[PDB]
Amino acid sequence: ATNRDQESSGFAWWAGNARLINLSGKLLGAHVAHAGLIVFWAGAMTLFELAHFIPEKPMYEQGLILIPHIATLGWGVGPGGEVVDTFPFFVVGVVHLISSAVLGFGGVYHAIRGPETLEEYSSFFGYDWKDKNKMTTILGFHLIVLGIGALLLVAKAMFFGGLYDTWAPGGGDVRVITNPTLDPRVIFGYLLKSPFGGEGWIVSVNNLEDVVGGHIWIGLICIAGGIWHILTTPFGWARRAFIWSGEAYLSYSLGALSMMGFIATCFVWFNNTVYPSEFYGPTGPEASQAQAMTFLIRDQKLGANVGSAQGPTGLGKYLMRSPTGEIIFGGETMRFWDFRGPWLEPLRGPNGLDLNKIKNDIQPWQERRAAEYMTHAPLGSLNSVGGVATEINSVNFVSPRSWLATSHFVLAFFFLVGHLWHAGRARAAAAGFEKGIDRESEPVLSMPSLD
């Protein structure tokens, strides 16, 4: 039983997987088996959601997070995001579940049956962490794989049905993308936008052309980069900047994933293009705006002139100006004037909300949508009591946006912590004092006093 106790390995049971660092075969096993866990949950969770799914209820009233992902890809839904066929959901679930058996098979094999190290078995599959060439090669392989994935999204969008477009003219619908955005000024344009209000960095992408073109770019970039890293080896400056060891690489990736986690938190919280509100429920900004819209409509029906109605503070009760002058909804929702949504934009003119359009052009479907979104705001308790914290039990509801955002903030945080942990440790181990200070060679004792 090689390296399977503290004495031989140096690692206690609670750090047991650290015993795998230089056992590439077993480590392979751990990784493949874990991939199997991921795929397993995707499939099983999908089948669970589908069993618990009532087609004529909004997805977001049913605690669904995966079916919305499938539906966004254009599978199983029609105009307005109405479910017209569940079978694609069923397929996604079943095929993932079946695939997890394969992955788990390979993982268990490599983990407790196969060659514990791969280097004597195969020079192709074996590796040394310190071998910069091989490391960048495997990195290359996987970059090519990722690019291929992004290109699969592109292919879905352009050649196999299209995507769900909440912005489609005449109403949200599945649409084939025929003219993806290829101009780098726009694509990287997003990358150089401020993350602050009214800008929102990449989180602000608001049309499917930009999304598809983005994935075209990312796909080519990843494939090119992958080839590049297969054919090259780190340059001198890189060599001198980094720690080259398993734990170091792990730490780099932990940093990356923490970053991605925070980004996804903001994506699901603000964006309603790749997270359509039809499936995920309205955003916080969206529901606040929707309340304003709802009472503007009600009161104006009762005969109120909403353009001239002065509220208690002196600001408009229904309508006011943004700090740069655009006409926007009044009350606290003044904070959310950067919100943009298919049900509100027809009332928007060049200077913002248009009073004539507001007076004459509001359709019943808009009233409906604003009422729906206002009454499904992403607020709710841990035991899934919908509404403000003072609300009485009655409505079983917490928004998918809340679930997704909170879960991924938590994970991104602990992953930042993990990055600090493993980076600090990788530095200490590479320098050789990760186990403590050498009593006979205590560095501070050879330093001059501070005073």
Partner 1 sequence: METLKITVYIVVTFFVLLFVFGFLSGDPARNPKRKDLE
Partner 2 sequence: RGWFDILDDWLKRDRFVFVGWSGILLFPCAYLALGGWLTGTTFVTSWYTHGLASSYLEGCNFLTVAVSTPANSMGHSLLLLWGPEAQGDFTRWCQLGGLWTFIALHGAFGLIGFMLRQFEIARLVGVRPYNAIAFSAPIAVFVSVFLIYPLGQSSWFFAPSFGVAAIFRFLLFFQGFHNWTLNPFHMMGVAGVLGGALLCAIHGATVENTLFQDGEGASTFRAFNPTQAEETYSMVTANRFWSQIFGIAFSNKRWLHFFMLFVPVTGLWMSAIGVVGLALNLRSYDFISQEIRAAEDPEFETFYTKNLLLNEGIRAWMAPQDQPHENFVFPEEVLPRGNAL
Partner 3 sequence: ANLWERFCNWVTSTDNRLYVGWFGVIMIPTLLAATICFVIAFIAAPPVDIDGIREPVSGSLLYGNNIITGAVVPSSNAIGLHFYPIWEAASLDEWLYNGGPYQLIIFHFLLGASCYMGRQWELSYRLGMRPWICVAYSAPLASAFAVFLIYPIGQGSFSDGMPLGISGTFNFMIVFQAEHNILMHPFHQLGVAGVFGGALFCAMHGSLVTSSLIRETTETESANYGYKFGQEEETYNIVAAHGYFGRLIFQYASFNNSRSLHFFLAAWPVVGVWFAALGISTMAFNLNGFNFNHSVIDAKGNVINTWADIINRANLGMEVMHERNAHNFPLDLA
Ligand X SMILES: CCCCCCCCCCCCCCCCCC(=O)OC[C@H](CO[C@@H]1O[C@H](CO[C@H]2O[C@H](CO)[C@H](O)[C@H](O)[C@H]2O)[C@H](O)[C@H](O)[C@H]1O)OC(=O)CCCCCCCCCCCCCCCCC
**Contact between 305 and partner 3 (CB under 8 A)?**
no
Cβ distance 91 to 10 under 8 Å?
A: no
Given 185, 240, 435, 439, the residue binding ligand LMT (CB under 6 A): 240
Q: Was 432 annotated as part of a binding site?
A: no
Cβ proximity of 280 and 376 under 8 Å: no
Query: Distance (Å, rounded) from C-alpha 267 to C-alpha 273?
Result: 10
Among residues 32 and 370, whose Cβ is nearest to partner 3?
370
Binding mask 220-259 for partner 1 (x = CB under 8 A): -----------------x-xxxxxx---------------
Confirm whether residue 386 is marked as ligand binding: no
Q: How many residues bind ligand CLA (CB under 6 A)?
A: 73
Q: Say if CB 65 and CB 400 are below 8 A apart.
A: yes
Tokens of 220: 């080519």
Binding partner of residue 438 among ligand X, partner 2, ligand LMT, none, CB under 5 to 8 Å per kind? partner 2
Q: Is 413 in the site for partner 1 (CB under 8 A)?
A: no
185: contact with partner 2 by CB under 8 A: no
Position 11 contacts partner 2 (CB under 8 A): yes
Alpha-carbon span 344 to 353, nearest angstrom: 9
Given ligand LMT, ligand CLA, ligand X, none, residue 240, with its beta carbon under 5 to 8 Å by kind, binds: ligand LMT
Q: CA 343 to CA 286: how far, in whole Å? A: 10
Residue nearest to ligand X (CB): 200
Q: Is 41 annotated as a binding residue?
A: no
Main-chain phi, psi angles of 271, to 5 degrees: -85, 135
H or E segment to which residue 353 belongs:
strand 352-353
- How far apart are alpha carbons 135 and 319 in whole angstroms? 59
Tokens matching residue 261? 């986690």
Q: Is 109 in the site for partner 3 (CB under 8 A)?
A: no
Q: Are 98 and 46 in contact (CB under 8 A)?
A: no
Ramachandran region, residue 327 (left: φ > 0; alpha: ψ -120 to 50; beta: rest): beta
Instruction: Decide the pairing of beta strands 163-165 and 327-329.
Output: unpaired
Question: What residue 129 binds from partner 3, partner 2, ligand CLA, none (CB within 5 to 8 A, per partner kind)?
Answer: none
Per the DSSP assignment, residues forming a β-bridge with 83 are 77
415 is a site residue for ligand BCR (CB under 6 A): no
166 binds Ca ion (CB under 5 A): no
Report residue 320 as tokens.
């006011």
Q: Does 333 bind ligand X (CB under 6 A)?
A: no
Footprint (CB under 5 A) of Cl ion, residues 290-349:
331-332
Euclidean distance between the first and final Cα of the chain, in Å?
Answer: 54
Which residue, 199, 210, 94, 217, is CA-closest to 163? 210
- 315 is an interface residue for partner 3 by CB under 8 A: yes
What is d(CA 450, CA 230) in angstroms, rounded to the nearest whole number? 49
d(CA 235, CA 273): 41
Q: Does 17 bind ligand CLA (CB under 6 A)?
A: yes
CB of 99 to ligand BCR, least distance (A): 9
Q: Is residue 57 at the binding interface for ligand CLA, with CB under 6 A as the rule?
A: no
215 binds, among ligand BCR, Ca ion, partner 2, none (CB under 5 to 8 A by kind): ligand BCR
**Binding residues for ligand LMT, total number by CB under 6 A:** 2
With CB cut-offs between 5 and 8 Å by kind, which of partner 2, ligand CLA, Cl ion, none does residue 191 bind?
Answer: ligand CLA
Q: Which residue carries 């009591």 as its tokens? A: 385
Of the pair 259, 334, the CB lying nearest partner 3 is at 334
Rounded distance between C-alpha atoms, residue 407 and residue 391, angstroms: 23
Structure-block tokens of residue 38: 């991921």
CA distance 316 to 330: 6
Residue 339 C-beta: closest distance to partner 1, Å:
28
208 is in an annotated binding site: no
Pull the structure tokens for residue 276.
Answer: 């359509």
Q: Is position 38 an interface residue for ligand BCR (rule: CB under 6 A)?
A: no
Q: Does 284 bind Cl ion (CB under 5 A)?
A: no
Residue 27 counted as an annotated binding residue: yes
- Residue among 117, 277, 258 at smallest CA distance from 206: 277
Q: Give the residue with the Cβ less far from ligand X, 55 or 195.
A: 195
Residue 205 makes contact with ligand BCR by CB under 6 A: yes
What's the order of all strands across the beta sheet hosting 352-353? 319-321, 327-329, 352-353, 348-349
Out of 83, 154, 187, 405, point to the residue binding ligand BCR (CB under 6 A). 187
* Token output for 360: 């004459």
**Residues annotated within a binding site for [CaMn4O5] cluster:** 345
**Residues annotated within a binding site:** 13, 27, 30, 92, 106, 138, 211, 225, 345, 404, 415, 418
Residues of this chain that interact with ligand LMT (CB under 6 A) are: 237, 240
**Residues annotated within a binding site for chlorophyll a:** 13, 27, 30, 92, 106, 138, 211, 225, 404, 415, 418
Residues of this chain that interact with ligand BCR (CB under 6 A) are: 29, 33, 36-37, 40, 94, 97, 100-101, 103-104, 107-108, 111, 187, 190-191, 202, 205, 210-211, 214-215, 217-218, 241
Residues of this chain that interact with Cl ion (CB under 5 A) are: 331-332
